[PDB]
C-alpha cells in the first residue's frame, strides 16, 4: 500500500495524473491515496479477522454482539489506520508539513497520519500525536453536539407537547385544530406494529 501511494505521488509529481470529473487535481490525488490506504486497512483487517481462532475472546464478544466490532479487532491486531481531522488527512499545521520531523510537501501515508501499527504493536511518536488529534476530534464532537441537539430536543417538545389522540380518534393540538384525522394515518399505536412483507408486490 505504501508503494502504491508512492506511485500515485510520483504520478502527481510528474503531471501524469489527470483529474476525474467533479473534482480538482488535489482532490483526485487525495481520493486515490485514501482509496489505497482504506483498501490496505480493510485487507489487513480481513487478514487479522481470518487469523482469529474459535477461542479468541475478542471474536467471542464481537460474534455475540456483546461488545466491540471487527474494526476494533483490526485496530488491535492489524493496523490502526488513517487518522482524519475534519474528514481529511492530517493537515499541514506547520509550513507545508504536518510535523517538524517530515520534509516539506510530503503527501506520503506516514506523513499525513496513517498509523501502520496496531495497538498491540504500539504507535510511533508521530502516529501517537496524529491519533491524539483524531481522538480530540471525537471528544470535541461529543462535547459540542450536546448543546445543539438538546436545544433541538427542547424545541421539538415545545412545538408538539400538547398534540394528543382524542376520544374521536383524531390527533389534535391544544387549540383543538386537527393535525391528523387518525394517528399515523392508520390510528394504530407504534408499539404493536412490526415488520412484514407484502407477498403480492414484487
Amino acid at each position: 500500500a505504501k508503494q502504491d501511494v508512492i506511485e500515485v505521488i510520483e504520478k502527481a509529481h510528474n503531471n501524469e495524473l489527470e483529474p476525474t470529473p467533479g473534482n480538482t487535481l488535489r482532490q483526485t490525488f487525495e481520493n486515490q491515496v485514501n482509496r489505497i490506504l482504506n483498501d490496505a486497512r480493510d485487507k489487513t483487517g480481513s487478514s487479522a479477522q481470518k487469523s482469529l481462532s474459535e477461542y479468541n475472546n475478542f471474536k467471542s464478544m464481537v460474534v455475540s454482539g456483546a461488545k466491540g466490532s471487527k474494526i476494533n479487532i483490526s485496530q488491535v491486531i492489524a493496523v490502526v489506520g488513517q487518522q482524519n481531522v475534519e474528514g481529511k488527512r492530517i493537515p499541514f499545521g506547520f509550513k507545508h508539513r504536518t510535523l517538524p520531523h517530515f520534509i516539506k510537501d510530503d503527501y506520503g501515508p506516514e506523513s499525513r497520519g496513517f498509523v501502520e501499527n496496531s495497538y498491540l504493536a504500539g504507535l510511533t511518536p508521530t502516529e501517537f500525536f496524529f491519533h491524539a488529534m483524531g481522538g480530540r476530534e471525537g471528544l470535541i464532537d461529543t462535547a459540542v453536539k450536546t448543546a445543539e441537539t438538546g436545544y433541538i430536543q427542547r424545541r421539538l417538545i415545545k412545538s408538539m407537547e400538547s398534540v394528543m389522540v382524542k376520544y374521536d380518534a383524531t390527533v389534535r393540538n391544544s387549540i383543538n385544530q386537527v393535525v391528523q384525522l387518525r394517528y399515523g394515518e392508520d390510528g394504530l399505536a407504534g408499539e404493536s406494529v412490526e415488520f412484514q412483507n407484502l407477498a403480492t408486490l414484487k
Binding site: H13, N15, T24, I103, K104, D105
Partner: protein, 117 residues
C-alpha cells in the same frame, strides 16, 4: 500581451492616468495633479489574465535551496551548472489547482538555477 505597469509624472511623481488626444487621435499619459503629458509607447491600457497563466518559476528564489526542511534529490541534475543535488517543492500557491507539479532548484551556491520537469 503582457501586463501594463504604472508610470509616474516627471514633476509631481504622481501616477500618470490614460487620456486620448482627439487632435492627433493618439494615446497620451497625463497627470491629473500637475499638467504633464507623455506619448505612450505600449498602446495597451489594461490587461486581465483571467486564466492566471503565471510562470511560478519567476516567483521562486534560489535562496530556498538553503532550506534544511526541503527535500533534496540526486536524480535531476542542473542543466545550467551540472550539479547533481537539487531541492524540489510543490507550488503551494493559491489560484493554482494543478499544484502537485514539482519545481526544482539547484543547490550549488551562486548558480541557483530553477526549473520544472
Amino acid at each position: 500581451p503582457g501586463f501594463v505597469g504604472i508610470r509616474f509624472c516627471q514633476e509631481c511623481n504622481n501616477m500618470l492616468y490614460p487620456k486620448e488626444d482627439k487632435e492627433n487621435r493618439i494615446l497620451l499619459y497625463a497627470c491629473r495633479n500637475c499638467d504633464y503629458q507623455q506619448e505612450a509607447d505600449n498602446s495597451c491600457i489594461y490587461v486581465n489574465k483571467i486564466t492566471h497563466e503565471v510562470d511560478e518559476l519567476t516567483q521562486i528564489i534560489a535562496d530556498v535551496s538553503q532550506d534544511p526542511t526541503l527535500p533534496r534529490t540526486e536524480d535531476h541534475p542542473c542543466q545550467k551548472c551540472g550539479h547533481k543535488e537539487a531541492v524540489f517543492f510543490q507550488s503551494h500557491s493559491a489560484r493554482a489547482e494543478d499544484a502537485m507539479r514539482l519545481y526544482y532548484v539547484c543547490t550549488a551556491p551562486h548558480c541557483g538555477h530553477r526549473w520544472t520537469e
